[PDB]
């Protein structure tokens, strides 16, 4: 298991009047840790945790300014895509940005990751070398080639596999009391039935802590997935995250169902 | 790419009548961005409702949690009510206490 820094970036263009809309968004692991919008008054990157509150004014001036920069360069490309993609301007269209890294446990990389995308679509991503680029398409083979003149991977094997390590490696530092305490979940049945033969035996996995969690039911030590239901999991919305899988059964039958919870906060039990 | 927006009203924690709680409305799978989701009280809508900051999944869907305090009762009926391009009706989904 390792760690993460990851930014999500959204332009969204505005035909009626205006500027398109940019809202970056940054997390360590499963935390959000700062917010830019630009409908917001401050024009500004607030801390949205804890533990980058104690960063100097500095921090947010350098931070400010290049999601401030980043807005102008889509709104520029927001443009240049719809040439590309010969699109009438009367139309709304996005662009996204993920880009990030992965350290392991002891501070030292793993991977690094930086891809875009036109309306939901794939537009173009580094490769996982971080030295050549995947064009999806014939627009985006545009940008290759220019990206490629520009030897800009250059730049981004710069930012993901040190700067990227290093503010990384830091906010787990300052952040340890959060980012580095797993939450195992608050797990419980609950039995509903329904007319006398059918029952609904629902487990639920609450309060966890990253989310990777993986629920399962099992009749009789093998695993049942006929009749099951689960849902995805979702913000409990104080940090932690929440889960539940069921199945039918038979009244009478329930103490045929282990439900087997596993997360990394608990050395997987029952 | 267009699709829709995936719904699962919930609250933060097990929900106890009188109690004060929280009420969930998690929208996510969407794709335009552009949503509008309001959380009903007995058909009416709850203004003083936040949301999250709009990230997206892995497949650039976007997600958003939509959530107000609530105390249950049981009378007091409990919704959302999300609308979105993808929907010739909005889709309203009716907060029940076992999921």
Redesign the interface.
Known sequence: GSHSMRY?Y?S?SRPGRGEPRF?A?G?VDDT?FV?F?SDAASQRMEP?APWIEQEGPEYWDRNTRNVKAQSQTDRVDLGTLRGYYNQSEAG?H?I?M?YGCDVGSDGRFLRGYRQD?Y????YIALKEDLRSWTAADMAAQTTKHKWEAAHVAEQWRAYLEGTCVEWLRRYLENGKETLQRTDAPKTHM?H?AVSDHEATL?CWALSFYPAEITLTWQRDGEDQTQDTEL??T?????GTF?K?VAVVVPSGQEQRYTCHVQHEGLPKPL | ???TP?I?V?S??PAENGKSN?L?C?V?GF????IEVDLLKNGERIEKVEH?????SKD???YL?Y?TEFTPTEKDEYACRVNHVTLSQPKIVKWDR??
């Not at chain 2, 999250?52 to 997206?56: A, G, N, V």
């Open positions: 999500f959204t969204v809202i968004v997390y959000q917010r919008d949205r709304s996005t996204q993920m995308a309306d939901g679509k794939d609950t509903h629902r849902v995805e979702r913000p409990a919305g104080d929440q539940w | 790419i267009q699709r995936k699962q919930y933060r924690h929280f969930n998690y996510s794709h335009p961005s552009d999250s900051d709009l990230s997206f650039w869907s976007f949690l959530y076992d999921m």
